[PDB]
Design a protein around this ligand. Structure first.
Ligand SMILES: CC(C)C[C@H]1c2[nH]c3cc(OC4CCCC4)ccc3c2C[C@H]2C(=O)N[C@@H](CCC(=O)OC(C)(C)C)C(=O)N21
Ligand SMILES: CC(C)C[C@H]1c2[nH]c3cc(OC4CCCC4)ccc3c2C[C@H]2C(=O)N[C@@H](CCC(=O)OC(C)(C)C)C(=O)N21
Ligand SMILES: *[C@@H]1O[C@H](CO)[C@@H](O[C@@H]2O[C@H](CO)[C@@H](O)[C@H](O)[C@H]2NC(C)=O)[C@H](O)[C@H]1NC(C)=O
Ligand SMILES: *[C@@H]1O[C@H](CO)[C@@H](O[C@@H]2O[C@H](CO)[C@@H](O)[C@H](O)[C@H]2NC(C)=O)[C@H](O)[C@H]1NC(C)=O
Lengths: 118, 566, 107, 566, 118, 107
């Protein structure tokens, strides 16, 4: 219901990328699915994957082995861990919320920009 | 030993009329056409027919035949009842263990076998397999020498051979009968019945009993059979087989014409003046179950291509199912794939248990011969073959399917759910195999019982719960769902696997389901099919499969106990 | 997967004018289509759910009338506050794909 | 007519070495043990073996054997190839229609049959059925007289009989050979091969060719065979069959010892001084397809218990399915019951099409004998048996299932949906039957092809769309769904039936579905399975079943065309 | 959304019973299911059956062959036809509305009383 | 079918008091339970849907907390306008059955 990304805004190539979305106003272990969306320069949205309310996860097949989403139910956080990063995915990363019964990405984050350079 | 039979009127239709004659120690033969009495008099003289039809008396040395007669005389089947997957040493040890007494030492019994196997001339093939379809074995001329030795273990005084030359070649059949003539000089009264012998065979006999259409047409010495029909009004040309000459007279070069000639003979009155001179278990249960289960296990090892081939199919199909259903998802397709793999696994255990028809059907003529001869009971033959064939061959695919597919598919990752699935697949394999034995026991063809198993399965599999919803069937059909083995196995696997499951991602529906008609948790699927959610709703299905094992293995026992053994 | 095509990648309209945005799918979506509006510098915002319904907090000038594979968005009598980029998402199949986006302009 | 063969070296292993001799018009016989040349020389003299192994020449009256030899000489099989469900009049009319020319009037051909059936003595059984398992018929002594008459229609000058007495009784076998001796006085050279004859048989011969292990051991007059072996160093006792005496010498009362005695004879040099005196389609295609299809239809009527029994099973199972699934509801259980009855109907049409294995397997020895004899082509035998057996027996259950269950269940009440379902069940019955013929054509056992059909069906039936969702399979397995017949039939029945359907009562979900994960209309079910909603998504499934009929009936044609006919 | 029953308030035994519910404010061929509920004297509610928005129908099995529900889409009416009437079902008949996605009988009629006497 | 049992067929309470109504089913309903309130002389009125949710137009004194086969209704601090007859309906299986009803009273 109120989402907020945070993380390093720059990263060396082929190491790892870590983000964090802290949810306030709702419990992430209660109802919805919690997902990550990136928007490239030359704007095209691209879905990455979600973690469920019960810990199950599902990722985009174009990000094979490189993405993993974990959570920390003690303080309502879920994490993006994108590893071996190329300089092509210098996108804007969002955390969003999926209703399930409605089917649409209802709530969105503010959006943080990640630049992959050297 | 002298047999002496008198005035036999056997009936089912009186296909024997009145047959007289004694059988002195020598080499006695019973000739004639096929439909006559050459096969029926031999089963009367060896007590292999029902005494409800028997009329006259059969006497031995002035004493009637006791109940110990079937154990003290050897009867040899026409076709070989030897175990072709055991060796010649092992087949004689099985016959020695269940017919000789338990007092005798194993050192004493092995010398009795060495006396037999040296007398028959089986020294070069004493440790060779007799032979099957899949095994190169000992030739058919020494399968017949083996089966004579399985009846000479108790040293009988009277041997009964049933067609000792039918099925053998011409050079082979002289080697069997020259063996028998050496046996006849030891004092063993040999009584057999040959289909159309040759003069090299006919020159060896000591007595002849010619029968056609249930009428005695000659009985006396076999040398005087030619001179009898010359003096009856017939003539034998040169270079003619006299045994071919005798059945030529039967067919008309009449039966009531030629049977009355024998009554007016000097051979009938000499026989009639002899019959009035004379007239006027062993083994414990645990020892029978030890040796029936031992031979039935060597057969299971000595035939790998019907035992290894069911393990190869289990591993290959277990990997094909694990690849198609590789790790299951908790999404909209997740109910369909779990209900479809668990339906395939229970109806595979049913249709692959049609090979249990072959258990009591192939061994039928060997069960009937060895029961009359007095080796074992029906109870120790039944339990000793369930213990050795049915028990280990139905445990192994139920373990191999569950070990392969459980962690490829990603079923419920608990330790007790792993073993309930292994135990549920194992009870549905026994219950379908017991049903196959309850139909096939007593029958002698495979193809009718194999079809009747398949018809009953496809009606049990409509009532299993995937094709039709069992809560929607009309009340006058819905009692038929209690008679179906795949219903109880597929209810117990669905109960095991669908309990703590969610299937709508992003929707917590286990506290409340917003917007019904959804099926978002595994309890909603499971109640909608009609499955109880209590822990008795799981184990109700196992006490109903255990009660069908006990019923179907009692029907299978009573069909062997009440069988026509004669 | 299912790819979503917005072949009119730009427009050029004026105020009070009716504009129509089309979205084409490579599979049957069965009205599982959503529309998003992204102002420059903000997250996308949900506009239409289920290809016909409209969200509380938007005027009754937007409407979606689609069926099958052809879905469309109609902005009748657009204001100044309606210029932006419009995306179409499917949420039928499991890798949720968006459209390419179409950027309205003012002549 | 005189055969005169010279120096034959047949090879596959040279199991014939060098055999010489002429065969004058009379009653010629080929004796010896079984593994020798008694069965191989007869197939060389009648051109029933492959000429790639043949070495020497076979000459008739100074002229070599043409390609017209198989049509102008009659060969008679050992076991009866007569149609047991037709009568003795009808079996000779089929042989007269396809071997005699089309110039002859039906008045001319029926007199030729009346000359044959009067000569054989079949007047009392001229209009009786020959006999099957289910029909009491003419006895086995006159099935052999019938099959001789099927080869005497064209009046051949040379008859070749293959074991004319094996399988008959002793009184029967004299009645067949006394018929042949009357034929031999008409001028027909009769050449046969008897397994172990009798002196009543041996006294009738006119020549004898004794063979053992591919070596010529006697050839000459059959009367002089006894005096030859007396002068070789052997002695025949009194009352011995001379034909039993000859094979007694073969077995050792050696082969290279006794074959060299024949080279130094007065019989070999007289034969050698004779061979150097001499040396030094018919019918149109439409007439063959008329009579193959006519006899194959009388067989289908004359065997009711395999044709009526499949109509009784169709009606009874059509009423059991109609009672369990009696009128379907548009509720939460409505998707399950429609997808389960349509899955049962397509996989019943597949498994009940395993009886098509029996079509080309039971008739194999009659196809091979009649093709070499030159009745029909492979093309008119193939098309004439698809037209008569496969075509009407696979239309009828597809009509009876659809007429019974469609209005009991209450499927889509339109007229075009009724006939698409009837046509979809009919294409899946042909495609599964063509696959059964593509495997069984050429083989001679049923049980291996029956198992291989069943293994292929249970893999086609996982990939059909009920057990596993076909959109979830990995991309390296998902191409295997194109090789499955129940996928195309079950997609076309689901497309036909789930179109205008609603399944959530009280919820109009065809304009918009509130609260997804619901499946409230039949298009949502059908896209979720992966089925196209266009009208090509229906008829894609029928052009894929029609292309599998053409492929599988071409593989079944090339397996009969490229068969080993020899 | 606004339902109103009307019909004869008395009926002879073993003839037929006819009611009519005219719906205003909503189209009966548009969305919901439209059903009949009766309440006996000695109050116990009892569901009788519905007609769907698309003409399909479903009845209570205790009223076997005796109930039929028809509609008239020209003026938004649906009809109750209860035949061969006993003097035991002298209840109060209601017409109601079933949401489908919510699952509950949301809107109700005013209720008309039928007495079966002679 | 599924029969629904309200064994407390009556009560006797006072104002401001908490009363609890129980409903027992003969089968698993899986939260497909509704509660109805019938004033004397009126049609029944929906109170709770889905065994926990409450309808717009009712105070937050009513609550349903049920699971499995045991479902219950709690009226905490009842007013004068809360006396009536309370029914429980299942809408899981297809012949929708009601409970016997329970008639609150005022001491
Ligand atoms: C093991 C499997 C490939 C053959 C097995 C078998 N599974 C079935 C499962 C079925 O569920 C259907 C799936 C969708 C709904 C129902 C239906 C039928 C079958 C059959 C046929 C059965 C059979 O006719 N014969 C035995 C033994 C054959 C055998 O021993 O195989 C070798 C190669 C000789 C070693 C058998 O094992 N099957
Ligand atoms: C007609 C039916 C009773 C027998 C038929 C048949 N259907 C099947 C359907 C199957 O789908 C499964 C059902 C649930 C999902 C998948 C699986 C197997 C089968 C079989 C067996 C098959 C067979 O073994 N061969 C002929 C035998 C006909 C016959 O000769 O029997 C009579 C009584 C003498 C006429 C056959 O038709 N069946
Ligand atoms: C789904 O929602 C339910 C509520 O409807 C959650 O279950 C309750 O959670 C609260 C808070 O932890 C507990 O106090 C209750 O005891 C829980 N009730 C039950 C019946 O378990 C549940 O946690 C949610 N699902 C998941 C996976 O978290
Ligand atoms: C279900 O609701 C839909 C609304 O989306 C109805 O369909 C429309 O009905 C209006 C009113 O007559 C028509 O003008 C439209 O043309 C209809 N649209 C379509 C695509 O057909 C529909 O009638 C309702 N269902 C039923 C069975 O009546």
């Amino acid at each position: 219901v109120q989402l907020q990304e945070s993380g390093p805004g720059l990263v060396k190539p082929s190491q790892s990328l870590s983000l964090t979305c802290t949810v306030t106003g709702f419990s992430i272990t209660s109802d919805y699915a919690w997902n990550w969306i990136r928007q490239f320069p030359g704007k095209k949205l691209e879905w990455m994957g979600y973690i469920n309310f019960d810990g199950g996860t599902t990722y985009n097949p174009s990000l094979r082995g490189r993405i993993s989403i974990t959570r920390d139910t003690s303080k309502n956080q879920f994490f993006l861990q994108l590893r071996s990063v190329t300089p092509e995915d210098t996108a804007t990363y969002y955390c969003a919320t999926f209703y399930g019964a409605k089917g649409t990405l209802d709530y969105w984050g503010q959006g943080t920009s990640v630049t992959v350079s050297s | 030993a002298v047999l002496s039979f008198h005035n036999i009127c056997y009936r089912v239709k009186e296909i024997l009329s009145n047959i007289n004659g004694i059988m002195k120690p020598g080499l006695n033969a019973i000739l004639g056409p096929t439909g006559g009495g050459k096969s029926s008099l031999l089963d009367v003289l060896a007590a292999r027919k029902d005494p409800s039809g028997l009329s006259g008396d059969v006497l031995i040395n002035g004493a009637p035949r006791p109940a110990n007669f079937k154990c003290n005389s050897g009867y040899v089947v026409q076709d070989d009842v030897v175990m072709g997957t055991l060796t010649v040493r092992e087949n004689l040890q099985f016959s020695a263990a269940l017919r000789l007494a338990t007092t005798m030492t194993n050192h004493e019994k092995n010398e009795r076998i060495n006396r037999v196997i040296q007398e028959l001339g089986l020294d070069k093939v004493a440790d060779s397999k007799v032979g099957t379809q899949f095994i190169r074995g000992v030739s058919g001329g020494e399968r017949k020498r083996t089966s004579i030795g399985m009846e000479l273990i108790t040293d009988p005084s009277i041997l009964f051979l049933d067609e000792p030359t039918t099925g053998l070649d011409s050079s082979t059949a002289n080697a069997v009968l020259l063996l028998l003539k050496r046996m006849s000089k030891q004092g063993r009264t040999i009584i057999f019945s040959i289909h159309q012998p040759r003069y090299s065979i006919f020159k060896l006999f000591d007595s002849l009993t010619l029968l056609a259409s249930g009428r005695l047409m000659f009985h006396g010495p076999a040398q005087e059979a030619l001179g009898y029909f010359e003096s009856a009004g017939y003539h034998c040309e040169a270079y003619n087989n006299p045994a071919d000459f005798f059945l030529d007279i039967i067919n008309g070069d009449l039966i009531e014409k030629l049977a009355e000639i024998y009554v007016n003979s000097s051979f009938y009155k000499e026989t009639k003046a002899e019959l009035h001179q004379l007239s006027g278990y062993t083994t414990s249960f645990c020892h029978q179950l030890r040796w029936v289960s031992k031979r039935s296990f060597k057969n299971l090892l000595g035939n790998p291509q019907a035992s290894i081939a069911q393990i190869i199919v289990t591993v290959v199909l277990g990997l094909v199912i694990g690849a198609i259903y590789f790790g299951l998802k908790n999404d909209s397709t997740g109910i369909q794939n779990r209900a479809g793999v668990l339906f395939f696994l229970t109806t595979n255990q049913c249709f692959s248990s049609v090979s249990a028809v072959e258990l009591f059907v192939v061994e039928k003529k060997l069960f009937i011969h060895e029961y009359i001869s007095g080796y074992y009971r029906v109870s120790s033959y039944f339990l000793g073959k369930l213990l050795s064939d049915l028990l280990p061959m139905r445990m192994l695919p139920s373990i191999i399917f569950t070990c392969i597919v459980y962690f490829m598919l990603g079923l419920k990752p608990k330790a007790d759910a792993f073993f309930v699935m292994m135990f549920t697949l194992m009870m549905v394999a026994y219950s379908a195999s017991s049903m196959a034995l309850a139909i096939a026991a007593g029958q002698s063809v495979v193809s009718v019982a194999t079809l009747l198993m398949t018809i009953c399965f496809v009606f049990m599999m409509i009532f299993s719960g995937l094709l039709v919803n069992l809560t929607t069937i009309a009340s006058w059909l819905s009692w038929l769902q209690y008679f179906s083995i795949p219903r109880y196995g597929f209810t117990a696997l669905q109960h095991n696997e669908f309990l703590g499951q969610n299937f709508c991602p992003g929707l917590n529906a286990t506290g409340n389901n917003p917007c019904n008609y959804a099926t978002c948790t595994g309890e909603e699927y499971l109640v909608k099919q009609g499955i109880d959610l209590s822990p008795w709703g799981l184990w109700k299905n196992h006490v109903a499969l255990a009660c069908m094992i006990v019923i179907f293995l009692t029907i299978a026992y009573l069909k062997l106990l009440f069988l026509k053994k004669y | 997967d299912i790819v979503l095509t917005q072949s009119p990648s730009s427009f050029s309209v004026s105020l009070g004018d009716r504009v129509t945005i089309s979205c084409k799918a490579s599979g049957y979506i069965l009205n599982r289509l959503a529309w998003y509006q992204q102002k420059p510098g903000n997250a996308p915002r949900l506009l239409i759910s289920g290809a016909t319904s409209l969200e509380t907090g938007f005027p009754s000038r937007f409407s979606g009338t689609g069926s099958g594979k052809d879905y469309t968005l109609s902005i009748s009598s657009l204001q100044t506050e309606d210029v932006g980029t419009y995306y179409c998402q499917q949420y039928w199949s499991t890798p949720w794909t968006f459209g390419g986006g179409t950027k309205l302009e003012i002549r």
